[PDB]
Each structure stands twice: as structure tokens, then as C-alpha cells.
Amino acid sequence: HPDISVDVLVIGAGPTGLGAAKRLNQIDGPSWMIVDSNETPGGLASTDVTPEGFLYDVGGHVIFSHYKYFDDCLDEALPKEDDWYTHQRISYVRCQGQWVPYPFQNNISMLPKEEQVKCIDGMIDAALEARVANTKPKTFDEWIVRMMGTGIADLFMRPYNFKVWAVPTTKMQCAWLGERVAAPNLKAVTTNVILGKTAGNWGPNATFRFPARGGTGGIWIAVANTLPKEKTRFGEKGKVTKVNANNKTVTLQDGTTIGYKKLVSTMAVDFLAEAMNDQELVGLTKQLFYSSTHVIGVGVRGSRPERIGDKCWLYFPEDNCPFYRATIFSNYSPYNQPEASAALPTMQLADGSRPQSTEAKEGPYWSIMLEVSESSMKPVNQETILADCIQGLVNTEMLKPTDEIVSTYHRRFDHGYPTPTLEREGTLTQILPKLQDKDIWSRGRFGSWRYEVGNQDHSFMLGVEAVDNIVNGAVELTLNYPDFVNGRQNTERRLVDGAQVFAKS
Amino acid sequence: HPDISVDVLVIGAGPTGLGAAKRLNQIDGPSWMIVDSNETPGGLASTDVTPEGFLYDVGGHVIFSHYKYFDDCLDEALPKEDDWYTHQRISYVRCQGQWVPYPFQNNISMLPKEEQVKCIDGMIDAALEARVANTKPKTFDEWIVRMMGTGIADLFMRPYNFKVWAVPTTKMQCAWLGERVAAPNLKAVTTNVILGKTAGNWGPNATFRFPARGGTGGIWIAVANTLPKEKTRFGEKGKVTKVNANNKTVTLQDGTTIGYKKLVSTMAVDFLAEAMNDQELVGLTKQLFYSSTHVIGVGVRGSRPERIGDKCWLYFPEDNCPFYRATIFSNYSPYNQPEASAALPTMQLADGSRPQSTEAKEGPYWSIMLEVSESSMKPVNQETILADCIQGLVNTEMLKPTDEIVSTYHRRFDHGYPTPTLEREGTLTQILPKLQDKDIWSRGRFGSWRYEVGNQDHSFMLGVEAVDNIVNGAVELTLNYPDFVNGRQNTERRLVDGAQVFAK
Amino acid sequence: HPDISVDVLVIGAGPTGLGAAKRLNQIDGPSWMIVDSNETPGGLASTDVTPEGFLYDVGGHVIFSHYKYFDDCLDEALPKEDDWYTHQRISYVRCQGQWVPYPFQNNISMLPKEEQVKCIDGMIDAALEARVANTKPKTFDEWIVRMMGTGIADLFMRPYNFKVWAVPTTKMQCAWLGERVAAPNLKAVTTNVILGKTAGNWGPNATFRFPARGGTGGIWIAVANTLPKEKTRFGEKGKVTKVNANNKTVTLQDGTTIGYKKLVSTMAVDFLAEAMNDQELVGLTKQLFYSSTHVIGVGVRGSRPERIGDKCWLYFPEDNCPFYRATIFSNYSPYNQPEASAALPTMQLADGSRPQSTEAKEGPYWSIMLEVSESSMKPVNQETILADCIQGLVNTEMLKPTDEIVSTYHRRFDHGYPTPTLEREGTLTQILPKLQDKDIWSRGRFGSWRYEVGNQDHSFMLGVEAVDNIVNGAVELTLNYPDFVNGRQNTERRLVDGAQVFAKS
Amino acid sequence: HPDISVDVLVIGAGPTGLGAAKRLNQIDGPSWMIVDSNETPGGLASTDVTPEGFLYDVGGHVIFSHYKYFDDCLDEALPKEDDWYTHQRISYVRCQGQWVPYPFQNNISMLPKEEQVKCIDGMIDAALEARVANTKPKTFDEWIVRMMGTGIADLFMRPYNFKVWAVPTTKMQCAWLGERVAAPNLKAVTTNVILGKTAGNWGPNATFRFPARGGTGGIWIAVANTLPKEKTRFGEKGKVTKVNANNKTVTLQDGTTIGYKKLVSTMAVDFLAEAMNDQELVGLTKQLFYSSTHVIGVGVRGSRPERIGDKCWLYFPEDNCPFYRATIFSNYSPYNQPEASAALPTMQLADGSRPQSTEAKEGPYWSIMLEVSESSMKPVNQETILADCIQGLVNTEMLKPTDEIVSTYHRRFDHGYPTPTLEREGTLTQILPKLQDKDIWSRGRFGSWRYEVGNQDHSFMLGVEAVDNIVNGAVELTLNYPDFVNGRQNTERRLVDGAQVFAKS
């Protein structure tokens, strides 16, 4: 007999595992427990802070929910109006020394005239070929060219995506992008070129809220706080080292054993295979591909410069900087960095030189958060990446050479993005059912490896839905039908369902 | 306060209500109750029998299940292997003196050559147009012609569908047919014409199962029998006459009042609006369209004729008979008609003449079940319809003038088909949300009026999913996403879920 | 026996008849003669002069030659360099207060932006339709729309062509426009819009040459003069009143009869039929359709205004003027109007008022030549048309209200344009063979009634080729295959051929 | 000064040269003469006779005319009704044991059902692709697939065409075939499949005439006979060995020199370049391609077999025989072989064996004429080709093993077909204009190397039109516009033109 026994064991307390926990806690039927190797829940949705008091998420994290259930849990956890700030998405693409509103491909109207001609010519070819097309594109690259034309492909789509995915567009599928990549209408784009107009509102994150305190990580700490503490195990005491699928037994690092009837595993599925010592699974998970994410944080002295303004996040397709994206993280909440009265010495000028004075001085302060991808196809020099980022900020005019930097942050996250490669699905339809036969629900950003349902809300609901399938025979809709859930408001499942209303009488 | 109070009241015990009731019973949480005006559950999936012992469903009823859950409940209700008979899905189109295997277009080699030429030319036109199409069809008629071309459409789908829906194809939408592109398989059609080949869409793996006893109605009696009797109220004692949606009270014909928190209604939504005395809803529901169904049954003496053979159902596009569909119901089970030793006198010969003798003679017997549609656009003379059907049987060569008829059946069903008109969705998206705001889940063939999810399995699951929405916050997928549920096997929901396993 | 007998008789000494005569004269085989009701050769390619000394062609006459033989004859007739002036082919479309360079569609950058949007949207529709088109257009109107799209068609070609042909575009065929596919050059149009530019279809290469003296009519006078005078009969003495086809006899006004073996008739084919007293042909020829042309000439005091500049001809789709085309005729030759030192009183001002003084003053002068069409579908009031034209000049800002008009000219030409109606070919394929069966070659602008081969060079060559068919068995290519002769360099036939080189040795 | 001086010299007295000569003789202006290295004119339109009295043309020659001028000359040369026989075309394609009516691609209905399916599927594919095609095919092979689909390309078009052209379909252009290769209509073809009907009437040789005596060579002997003998020089005395284009001098084999003003050359253009000692022209002509033609004749004893019947010519795509075409030459005229009473011994049986008896037996007789192509991509064994042909006749059931062969014939013609290669036009546009600028008109099947205008009537008319361009400035329509002359009735030019009628008075 094992040390502990539960009907449902949840591994991991990022958004996916917490979703499982929350639904299990609502149903309040089967016994359960949730473990995490980190004392602080949140996973890639966590927040670090520098010794100087600057917060950094794991890159730009902006919340946009497709589900009422997710909203219910966030509102429960952070119930007050001043727990949140609401912002409009102000996003731009750095191109040729200018800021082009997102989406690029719908704002051709802002480029030099010569490039406008190239882009519109390319789009005209695309439109005429689309008129007679009777086959679907097979690669991301093919998709880009069919919907945007070469001009736009070559100018922004191709270089930016290599810069983010860390694999060429020719290596990825295209079934995943309905809600990620705006497809330009020929007439609309041409109309804006003629009028000199802009169109900055495409997409599900055009308006967003952000937690007042603790960064994104504050959400998941507060959500975890609503769970019964005795059913949790976070820290070194909660680290899973072995999974024995056949005895339905999990062994923790400190030697504790947990028996289960059903397993919801939210750790990276490649790690789960290793932990299962299942050599067949190990070989299959090695057919998946992922990229690593470097997060660089820069704290800057001064009131927010006019050139920065209300910008939220920014795209960089060009070669004068190594990052693909920057976030004005200090725009998301005044508690993301120190108050103006805080005294801090300058560490360096943006041009790389030493400050004229070592003396601690006051603020105010603003804050830039940068992302750089890495993979076997796109290596990164880890030793110079911080300095390269800072020079890139100067190159792109986001920082003046004489700006004073008071804090720096750099952390590499090994599993950053699960890549939608051509091979992804053929591999997953082997992996997931094989795990499913053993009563293991592997779910989440790396649990199930599907980026198109890979944000905080998708993840949370993958966990909720896994439980709902285990207990109530529900369809796992987010897992198997991303386009279905992303194309509708999912209003039906609530934190208080009829089951609880009727039970309370 | 009312005579009875429950959390969830279910009106109607056809497949939909019995679906809600089965799921409520499984969950065993909130209190509930189910009523029906009829003593015998089953609704339009019931079975009648003539005084001569010939059974008739309400027209051809063939089960194709899209759901494990539906299968679980049927298996529980009729668990023995000899409770069912299995058959191949064999169907033919009657056209120009021939029985053409379904699907029609793959079998036009049976027609005269000059006609084959017209059909192929029309389908060539359709293939060439499909190659440059950049719009979706807007009507059932447009959809038909883009799939088949003019010649083939005019022979089968156009005239057949009028005889079925009792409205012209030009007045129906085509979204209910699903997402498949409306375009010909020109190569498949031309290949069968060149090879002079025929081929139906059946075989050892395209089968259905039919109940050994009691017709389709036997299924729902057996399913209803698995419910706790005290939670059911079927018969005159269970007839709903009034629905007060504001008080959440229902009133039965015998005076009994029932209070509910959530109502799952499976009666025709147009009767619901009347029972609610809601003038706005009456006005809206009267904008929906439906056709009535006449079922005619004919019992015939003799062993199964070779010309009939293993045929199950048959389509009739032509105007030499009033029915759109015929079913060799005696092929579905040996118990749908009397055994060979039963003695029955001949009532009349197929040509309408009197028999030589009035004496009772033995069988064996076989049986034909026919459907005739009626609407305001297509009247049916109730006094001559049986005789007109029997003549139709002679005209189509199903009966010989000499065949001996030993039993007849005729019944009219007012709500038969809910029609996919062009206006249907515009009307339903006003009606259903208005009922939802009053905690009324109106669901079913005429509860929600959507034919593409109007079979026995869909209906059942509509009731199941409505309950699952009420209790567990499930998405009502069958209701809102017919293409979704029809394009997959729905395996997740089971008669025994984790919930019940963890409890015991 | 008739008064005169010749092998080949030519009726008419416009360009077609002169062409037949030039080739007959060069061949110097069969006997021949040429007659005309007018003392001056030239036909509709003649030139008039006002009492004040302003010349006017029969509306805008600009030579574009498809044939070496035509060039040879023109060069023989006027061999000196200073017999001609050379100009670029400069034309504009008057539209919404703007002079838009031709071709209209490449210059819509001049229109309001909202209008450019509607034009480009229409042309995008047309390009998408053209990509899947599998039929030829059947009417002029369909051809216009397929080439331009709706918005651009409605601005220029549709309303302009009604004002030109005096019949709706939906009533004309479109085969006469040639074999090019009816389809937009969308990229060329959007490119000029994006770059905000204009460009006309003229330059150092795209030029025409115009006679230095006597207007277009001076050409035909000088060509006729190379013919042996004794073989010509121009004037009342040459007016044909009767053609007896069965006897091959023609009767002139003064009672003279001419016998022939072959007849080349260049008179209007409906007059030919009447003169043959052939009731069947009279019936067929009345089934043809033609418009009449009003030519209005206006002489203006002053040096050439800057707003007019180097303009040659101008198109008017709009209804603030009755003319469809204007020509800056004083730009064609300094001898189209009086010298600067010639003195003329002002007759009126452009706004219709009387001059302050009635005295003769000096120039210089410039000159405007206008064209107005008339048909049964489009009446013209002959008594107000001059004054309506002059008001048109003010409305279109060609003249200021103050400009001084020193000469006016108005003449109506009954047969002006042979109309390419839907019915034209059905009728002509009945008429021409019946005349052909009688050894009558009816050829010319109204001799054979085909506008697409209706220019000066086409006409001349219709005569040449008729003769070549009669003598040498040549194919009549211009008559029967307009697209063929218009699409190639016709260099083979020369004013000095092998036959003449060999015979002179 | 040379021995002889003429305005126009014609080299070669095949149809092309004779055409020039006839037109020169009709015009009767410039002096001229015609030379040939052969005593008997006719060129590739000549006829041989075996010692046993069997005639053979140079492969199947059938007369079908696009031009009245050609008819006038043939009728003058052979004016009696009994000088000619008229025949319907009875043509078939040998395929899988069956005779499939020509054209193959329009009689799919004759094949076995299984091949019908493959053929129609292929055609459906081509029909759908053609609905959206916006480019022209570049090669003969692409044309074949695009217009007939793969099934018919593989079954007939590809193998047959290599067998005739002696180069693969991928190496030929496709602008030449308007009148040679029927394009199948999907509806028409499938309709006949369904009804089991044939469509045997496509093309310009569906009816033809053949001369009663002397075979095709009889025509050209007779035409040459209408010329003034003193202007002809046929035989070794008329063999051209040198052409000096600068001096405009030609030198004959016997040392005779002829000066000319204009040269019409009809010998193969590669021979002309060598005779000119013009290395650059030799280089260019070596870029052209041609195939050689082996003609095999077989005389057979017996009344015409029933399996043979009224068949005229037959096609053989399959690899069970070397010939691409057989002609039942005895069906064309009773005088193409000996009378029935002529006694002849059997030379061999069709199975290859000798008869022992040398007895001369009577007829009647019938006759088969075969063609085998050869080129550097398709060698032919000249020593066995006769026997291989005869075995081919047995394999295809043309001859029974026991048939008695009484005469055999074999001759190789080096220049047989001028191949329409991809490179042909690019090469001819360098060659023909260069010769033109030296006053050399190179014309004919190998004079100008264009197969689409390479028949007897085309060739004759190339010579006629060259003279007409030289003397009368006529357009050379046959040379430059094959589709124009092939698509119309060419009635204008006649043997007696107006010029001769008028001059005779």
C-alpha cells in the first residue's frame, strides 16, 4: 500500500493543473490532490522580481479569455475592482525606422510608397491565385504566401516568424493560425493605402486586463489560495521523480508514494515519458519540437518618454536587434517597478558605458521586457545576449545612448513554445492515446503541446475539461477542437453549476 | 403551493424526454419527474398494430447511432442477442420501370442511353462550374443542382424531395445538409456508366439493427421501464394543459399542479406557446413550417416475392404513386406480422376486386409500409388515400393485380416533419432564447424543430444534453452544432461515468 | 454604246477612290477613270476655311499609318520636310474640373480619394472575374465593364461613347475593338495610384505629322495632283446620278454615260443602292445605322493660354457641354489660322456679350475645333448648337468669359460615323456579296461601312486593295481582316514594286 | 559577265519551284528560268516504279487543297475527268488488335471498356484544369496532356509521335498543329462512348483526289509540261553547286553561270548555306532538325482481301512493327500496279520463306506502301528494314503468313520531315531575314522548313507568293501566317487574273 491514495492525482500547478484542481474542488466528489515542484504555483505564468524591485513575467503575458469559467475563477481569486487594470492593446511593428500598427499586413498604408507597390502587387497575385485555388496549403510558408503575397511575406511574415519560432516557416503546419495571423482582404488593404488610413484592432487581445500587484504570477497564487491547503503539496516535497503507469503509483523526490485511479499530468510530456521510464514514449516525445525563451528585463530611470507613450507590446522582424518582441511592462501596472521616491544607483548607460556617478538617485522608473527565442536551428550566445539586447534597444531607438539603466534581468526557460511542426499531429496521435489507455490525461502547453490552445485560459480549461471528462463524460473540446472553442464564447460551464445550486437544498 | 415540486420537470416521454429522464436518473442528484399524455411512451417512435396482427411504425424507422450513450441505453433496455435482428442498409429508387440502387447517380447505367447522355452532360456542366465556384448554395435546390447537374436532379432529388417535404426545393435552406462541398463526383458516375455497372452503398459493414418484437416502439417501452415508476406519470393523468412560466408551475388535465425550477419540454414548441398563453411566442411559432405524415400499411398473403427480395426501403420520385417512401417492414422482423399458421381472410385483391372466397386461409404473410406527406401546399384526400396507395403499389410493380391483401392500416400524424425552410433559423433564434430566459429547455424533433438532428439518437441525446447543461454546465452540442455531432463518434459520455464509479 | 468606256471606273475621290486611282496609275495596265461630284478631292478628309481665315478639318483628323504604301504616296505628294509639322500625340479627358491624361485609368490619382477607392474596387472585381472568364463579351458595354470595372467605366468610357456614337453602348458590338482580351491591367492602375502619379501615352516616339498648309485637305489635293488630269472628272460634270448594274453603265449629271468592266464605288452604300434603283438593296442598306457630325470652329484672339498649352485633342464624357471631342487646331499648324499681324474685329466674348469696340485689332490667334454627334436617338438643335458649344467652352474652362471670339464656323455632315451596331455584320454580309456578284467593289468609310478600318490610311488601302484584287488577285485584307492589318507592319506593297522596276529595263 | 542573265532565277522544280515558275509564266513580265538537278521534276512529290510494275510515291501522298490557284494549275495540267479518282478518307489506327477510326482521340468508343475508363478519366482531368488555365502550353507534349489527358497521351499520342517525328513530344513546339491534331471535346467523346458511335470526319483530307496514272509524280510532270521548255534546265545540266549571294551569281555543275536580280531557292536551306560557302549560315542551319523517311513497298498477289477493304491509310502507334503508317496504294488507282493478267513469280511469302517454284502466275494484285522514320535519336537498320516491315505486316494482320509477295521496294530519303522543334522559330528568324536582305527568297518544305505549311498545295503556293511579293508586293501569307491560310478558302488568286483578261484586249 502506498503512502497516500486519491481517485485523481494532478501533477503540476501552473494554470492547467490549477484548472483541474478548481473543477475537482467544485465537483467535490472524487478525492484528489495536486503536487508541484515549486513552492509558488504559476508555472510559465509566474513572475520574477529583481533585487532592485522590478517585476518580470515570463515574457509578454496578456489575458484574454474565451471562457466564462476562467473569468469566474479569476474574479473569485481577485474580487476587487482595484485588483485589476484594463488597457487597450496598443501594438506596433518596428519597420524601417518607423512604428507600423499591428497587424502589419493590414497597415501597408504606412510604409514607403515603393514598398506599398511591392506589397500590393504581391497581394494582387495572391488574390488572383486564390480565385482558382482548389487545394489547401500544407505549410505555414504556403499559407503566408497564399493569403498575403510575396511582398508582405518577404517583408515581415517570413523573417519575424523565424525570429519567434526559431524554425523556418517551411517547417511548420498551418492548421493552428485562425486566431493568430490576420489574413488581409485585398480591397480593405488597398483602400487604406489609398486613404492613408490605419486599422489597429484585429484579434482577441485588442482589450485586456492585468493584475494590479505581483504580475501575472499574482493571479495563480491567489487562485491556488482558494484550494483546500491539505490537498496541495508545493515545493521540493511535491516534486515527481517517478511514474509507474502500471501500478498507478507516483513517487515524489522525498520518497513519498501516491496511488491514483486517474492521472492528470501537466508537466512537459517529454519529461513525463522519462519519469515513466517508458522507452517507447521517450522515442515518440523526441519527435516533438520546442523552442527555448530568453526573457531579458531592463529597468530605466526617468518618466515615461514621449516616444514610448501608451505602447503595450512591439514586434521586431528586423536584424538590428535579437529580440522578436518588447513589452513596456511598466505600462501594465505601476506596481511592476519601484515608486519614484525609491533611490537606486545607475548600473550602466544604455550605450554600455559606466555612469558618471555611482550615487543612488530617485526615479521615476519605467521598464522594458524582451524576448529572444533559441533552438537547435537558431543558436543563441547565452553569455552576450543581455548586452546584445541592450544594444538592440539603442539600435531601435527605444533607448537613447544616455539612458540610465538601474536594473537588469535575464532568465532562460528551456520549454518556451511547443512548435507546430509538420510532424506534430502524427506524433501526438501516437503519444496521447497511448497515455490515455493507462488512465493518464496529459494536458497543457507542454502537457498536450498544442500552441493554438496554449494560452493561460486554454491551459486552465484543458485542466477543467480533463476532470470533466474523467468524472462527467464531457467532450475534451479545447484539446481536440481548437477552432471550435476559439470561435465561440464558451458560456455554459460555470464555477457554480446547477449541480451545486440543487445540492445546497 | 403546488401539489408536487421537483427540481427538473420533463414534459413528454418520446426519445427526447426519455433521454432527459435517463440522464437525470443516472446523475441521481436533483429531483425530477416525467409526464406524458400517452399511457405508452415512445411518441413518433411508437408502433401500432392492426386487428389482424400487422405492426406498423410511424413510417420507416431505421436506427443509425452517432453516440455511445444512446447505444448503452439500448443495450441495457434490450440486452439479449435475440432481442434484435441485423440487416444491411438496402435501398432503391423506383424510376422508369426499374429498381435503381441508391445512390441514384452511381447507377444510371440502368436507364436508356439517350437519358444517360443527358445526365452525364448535365454533370459535366456541374463539375466545370464547381471548379470555379466561390459562393455557397443558398437553397436546397441550388445545392441539389450543383451536386448532380440538371438531368440527374430532375430525375430523382427534385421531384422526390417535393413529394417528401410537401414544399418546393427552392423554398428550403441547405445548411442542414452539412458542410460538404456541393459538387459532383464526375469520375465515379462516368466510370459506372462506361462499365455498365451498378453498386449500392451497402455491404456487410453498412447495417442497422431492428427490435425482434414490438417494432421500434418496443425499444422505448423497454427504456422507459428502466426508470423508477414513481417518477413517471403517463396517460390522461399526465397530460399537460397549462404552463405558467412566471410561477414555474405546470397544470395537468386532471387539475394537478407541478412546480419546477427547470423545465425540459419535448412537446411541439407551437403547442408549448399555446399552453403558455404567450401571444408573442404563439405569433413566432406560427411562422415555423411543418408537414403531416400519413402512414399506410398493407398486409399481403404469400411468401416474399422474388421481385421484392431483401429490399428494405425504397424511394418514389415519380407521380404514378402518392407515397414518397415504402418499407418492406416484414423484412425487418419475423414478428412484425402474423406467423404462417395464422388464418386470415382476404379483404380485397390489389386491383381492388373482391376475393373468390371469404374463408380464412393461412399465410405466410409479408407487409409494406408507406408514407405520404401533407401540407397547405400539397393537400391529401383522407377518404381516398388508402385506395390511391394500393393502386400506387400496382403501378410501381410492388404488387400484382392478383395479390391478396389481408390487412390495411391508415393513420394521419399532424406533426410529421419539421421543415428546413429558408425562414426557419430566423424564427428559431427568436423563439429558443426567449424560452431559455424563462429556464425552459424546449428540445426535440418538434421541441427544437431541427430535422438534421431529428432522428431517434439525436432526439435522445438532445434530452440527455439538456439535462447535462442544466446540471453540469455541458455544451448543448447536438442542439447548436449538428455538423459537429454528426461528423464524429461521440464516445465520451457513457451510461456509467467516472462520477458513478467513484461514488460506489 | 456609252460615251466613255474604261476597264475600271472609280466613283469618288476621297481617300478610298484616290487610293484605287493611285494603284491603277502605278500598275498602268487596264484603262480607268475617277469621278467626283466635288471639284476638290478629299471627301470627309477635306478642309474648309472661314471668311476670317480660320481653317477647319471635318473634325479632329490625326493620321496614324499602318501601311508603307500609304506613306509612299503621302511622301511623294508632299516631299519637303517643311510640308509637315510633327507633334506628340497629346490627349486628355475632361473630368470633374481636371484635365486627366489619356488613358483615363492610369491617371485617376487626380480624382478625389473616395472616388479612387470606388474605381479600384470596381477594377479588382473586374480582374477577379477576368481570371475565370470563358466567354467573349457580346456588346461594347460588356467589353467596357470587363476592361475597366464599373466605377471607371461610369466616369469615362460609358458616358463618352454615348456622346460619340449617339447610340447606347449596349446596342453596339465589340469585335471591332480587336482581339485583345477584355481584362484590366490592375497592377498598372494601382501602381500609379499608390505613387500618386500621372502619365499620358505619348512621348518622343508616339507622334503624328500634320500638313503645314491647307489642313488635312491639302494632302488629298496634292495626291490627286499626281494623277493624269485627263483621267479625272471632278465637279458637277462628275456627279453620278444613276448606276445600271445589269448593263455596267453609269450616268452622270450632265447626261454622260460611262461603261465599265469593274466598278469601285466609294460613295455611301445607301446612296449607291438608290442610284442602282435596286429596291432589295435599298431595303438592306436602310437597315444600317450611322450618326451625323456637327463640326464647330471657334477662333480666339490672344497668344495660346498656358492652361491650354501643348494639348492636341480632348475628350468630354460629362454633360456640361454638347461636344464629345475638342481639338486645339491652331496647335497643328501655324497656318491653320491668320498671322499675328492680321487684323480682325471681335464678334463676341465667350460669355455671349458684345465687345467694347467694333474695331479690327491684331492677333495673335488660336483656334478650337469641336465635334457634336447627331442621330435619331440623339437630336441636335441646329439653331442653338453653336451657342451651346461656346457655352460648353466656358463651362469646361477652355475659354474664360472674357475671351474674344473672332471667327465662328458650323457645318453638319450627314454621314459622319458608320455605327458598329449589333446588327451591322448581319446586314453587310448580305449587301456586299450581292454587289460583288455584279462586279461592284463598294469600299470606304461608308462604301463598306466598317469604322475599325475607317481612317484615312485604311480607306486609301481599301481602294488600293480593291484594285489589286481586280487586277492581281490579291486578298482584300483590310476589308475582311481588320485585326490582321491593324496588328502588323504592312511593308510589302510599295509605290514602286518589282513589276515597275523590271519593266523599266 | 555570266553565261545567262534573268530577273528571277528559280532553284528546284518540286511543287514549290514549279509554283514560282507557273506564276512567273502567268505574269509574263520579268525574265526567268528554273533549274533542277533531276531530269524529272516533282521532288518529294515524285513516283518510283519497281521492275515488276508497282508504283510507289514517297510515302502516303493525298491531295487536299486550300487554294483555288493550285486547283487551276492541277486542272490545266490534267484536264480530263478520267485523269483523276475521287475517294473518301477511310483511315484507322491499329490498337490492341482493333482498327480504331481516325482520329483516335475522338473514337475512344472503339476501345475495350477498361481502356475507356482510363481515357475518359484522363480527359475529365484535362477538362477541369483547362477551365482555369491562363497560359498556353509550351511543348507538343504539354499540349497533348492539356487537351487530351494522360490516358490518351500514353495510349496513342506519345508513342505514335515518337514513331513519326523520330524525336520525343517533349522536344517539339505546339504552334504548328491547328490542322493536324484534333482536340477532343469531353461531351462529344463521352457521348459516343455511351452510344457506341464513331466520329470519322475530322480534318481537311476527309475527301481527296488521286491521279489516275503515274502516281503523284504524274501531276508535277504534267504541270512542268505547261512551261516554256527553253526556260527550264532539268538534269545534271541544271544542278546548282555554288551560289554567290554578293555577285548574285549561281554556278551549275557543268560550269554554267547564271546572274539573277532575285533568287527563289527551294532546295533545303542547309544545302543552300553550304552552296553559299557562308559559314555563319551553315552554323545556323545546323540548329534546325529533320528526320529521314524510309519508304517500303510490297506488291501482293490476290484479289483485295476483305480485311483490307476500302481502307486508305492506317496508323501504327504500337511497337510490333517499325512503320508509323501504311497506305493501301492499290486503292488509289488501278494503274498503281500491274493488270490481273500480268504474270509474275512469287518472290517470297509473307512469313519470310521462299517458294520453291519459280512459276510466273497471274494476278490480280494489290499493294502496300509503308513509312519508317529515322534520325540521330532513332537509328534504322537499313539492311533489315524491308524484312522487319514485312514481319510487321504479319504481326498487324495486314498480311497472312501465306500471302505471296511479288515485288518489293525500299528507298531512303534523307530530308523527309522538317521537325517543329522548340528551337525552330528562333533559328528561322535568324536565317530567313538574312537571306531576304540578300534578295534570296528561300521557300518550301525544306526551303523554309515549316511543316504546318509543308504540303503540296502549301509548297506550290509558297513559290507562287514569293513571285507575287517579288513582282507585285503581295504579302507572303502562307509563309508567315499558316493558321490564316489554313482556316479560310483562298479564292482570290487565279491562273487567269484580271491582268490577263484586260491585256488580252
Side-chain angles (χ1 to χ4, degrees), chain A residues 24-79 82-117 119-128 130-135 137 139-196 198-228 230-235 237-241 243-305 307-332:
Chain A
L24 282 162
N25 192 62
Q26 176 190 350
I27 290 167
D28 192 33
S31 58
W32 61 276
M33 166 188 199
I34 180 170
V35 299
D36 196 291
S37 56
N38 199 316
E39 292 178 41
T40 303
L44 297 167
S46 286
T47 306
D48 280 344
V49 60
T50 73
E52 295 79 31
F54 293 71
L55 282 66
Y56 296 101
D57 282 347
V58 183
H61 274 69
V62 155
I63 268 164
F64 38 117
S65 176
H66 299 85
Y67 320 83
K68 281 284 187 49
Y69 190 87
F70 176 85
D71 300 349
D72 285 347
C73 301
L74 258 53
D75 297 338
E76 187 192 37
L78 287 168
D82 61 21
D83 286 340
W84 299 93
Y85 293 100
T86 305
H87 302 290
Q88 294 182 209
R89 167 187 83 223
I90 312 286
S91 194
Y92 293 85
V93 172
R94 185 78 180 158
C95 196
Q96 220 97 29
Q98 301 183 67
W99 296 111
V100 183
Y102 169 88
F104 178 86
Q105 55 255 65
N106 293 348
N107 290 267
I108 305 303
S109 55
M110 201 192 171
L111 304 157
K113 284 166 166 31
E114 280 292 68
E115 279 191 344
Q116 287 180 34
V117 171
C119 293
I120 300 289
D121 285 351
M123 206 149 150
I124 286 169
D125 296 340
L128 291 168
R131 185 54 181 92
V132 290
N134 68 350
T135 75
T139 72
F140 189 15
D141 200 68
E142 291 176 356
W143 188 99
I144 292 159
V145 165
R146 277 160 159 255
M147 302 290 123
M148 322 235 183
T150 304
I152 290 167
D154 285 347
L155 257 155
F156 167 68
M157 278 305 275
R158 289 170 158 166
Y160 175 76
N161 288 281
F162 175 82
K163 224 188 168 178
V164 209
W165 296 105
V167 304
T169 52
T170 50
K171 296 310 178 199
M172 292 172 44
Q173 50 139 283
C174 61
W176 60 272
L177 51 67
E179 198 192 44
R180 301 289 190 162
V181 181
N185 172 274
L186 179 62
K187 292 184 189 181
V189 166
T190 294
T191 291
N192 281 3
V193 171
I194 300 170
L195 296 171
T198 67
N201 295 129
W202 183 94
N205 53 16
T207 313
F208 74 97
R209 56 169 177 168
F210 191 89
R213 287 184 150 94
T216 297
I219 291 170
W220 301 112
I221 285 167
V223 171
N225 280 344
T226 69
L227 302 169
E230 75 278 356
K231 297 185 189 184
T232 67
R233 206 176 172 101
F234 305 153
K237 58 166 183 164
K239 180 172 179 176
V240 176
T241 65
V243 175
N244 189 322
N246 298 327
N247 303 341
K248 294 192 179 174
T249 293
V250 170
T251 300
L252 308 182
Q253 197 175 239
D254 62 14
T256 311
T257 54
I258 306 167
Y260 63 84
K261 299 181 181 169
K262 313 295 168 167
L263 180 61
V264 183
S265 178
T266 72
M267 57 191 291
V269 77
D270 52 353
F271 285 159
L272 165 67
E274 296 290 2
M276 287 174 57
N277 298 115
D278 187 317
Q279 195 58 47
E280 184 197 342
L281 279 172
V282 169
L284 293 178
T285 60
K286 282 186 167 184
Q287 298 173 11
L288 292 174
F289 200 86
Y290 62 95
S291 59
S292 300
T293 304
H294 292 257
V295 176
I296 289 70
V298 187
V300 185
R301 194 193 313 285
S303 43
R304 187 181 77 188
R307 73 188 179 273
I308 301 294
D310 54 11
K311 288 165 179 74
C312 293
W313 68 90
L314 305 163
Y315 298 102
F316 305 77
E318 298 176 330
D319 290 313
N320 65 345
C321 63
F323 42 86
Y324 56 88
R325 175 165 65 207
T327 299
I328 313 304
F329 200 49
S330 51
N331 277 350
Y332 291 9

